[PDB]
């Protein structure tokens, strides 16, 4: 919330259009339209069917951070003993598959523990949160002023 506020208020200050913030930040659609939708335009055109520019790595990182943030939702919503029973089928599949059952694990494959994927899902959430915004913060500002 605060870095959206810092970025959008400074985007109007640097461009001179302070009335863009002052008349649209009072409701969340102006936050949604005039800040999130409007400033992501040069970001998501970092690559397109008609070529690339210097915002291509930030466009890839923006979608990368969406993927890491959404992958964390798996560890936070789906919980352990679903996956432990799923691994037990996968463990059975390896043990009964010829030419692959000659390869055997030393550590038994178990699901991540209850604390662990709460940490792992949070780590994906946080890495997904940060890499999304740092891509959007930079490519919208460097696409407009840089």
């Amino acid at each position: 919330w605060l870095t959206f506020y810092w970025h959008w208020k400074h985007l109007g200050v640097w461009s001179g259009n302070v009335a863009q913030f002052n008349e649209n930040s009072t409701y969340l659609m102006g936050w949604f339209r005039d800040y999130l939708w409007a400033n992501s335009a040069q970001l998501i055109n970092g690559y397109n069917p008609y070529g690339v520019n210097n915002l291509s790595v930030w466009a890839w990182m923006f979608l990368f951070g969406h993927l890491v943030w959404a992958t964390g939702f798996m560890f936070l919503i789906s919980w352990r003993g679903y996956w432990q029973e799923l691994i037990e089928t996968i463990v059975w599949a390896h043990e009964r598959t010829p030419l692959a059952n000659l390869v055997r694990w030393k550590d038994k494959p178990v699901a991540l523990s209850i604390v662990q994927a709460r940490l792992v899902g949070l780590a994906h959430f946080t890495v997904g949160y940060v890499l999304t915004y740092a891509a959007f913060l930079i490519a919208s500002t460097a696409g407009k002023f840089g």
Binding site: G51, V52, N53, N54, S56, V57
Partner: peptide, 9 residues
């Protein structure tokens, strides 16, 4: 060659 020319800035 597109990304080499894009990032040669």
């Amino acid at each position: 060659e597109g990304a080499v020319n894009a990032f040669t800035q």
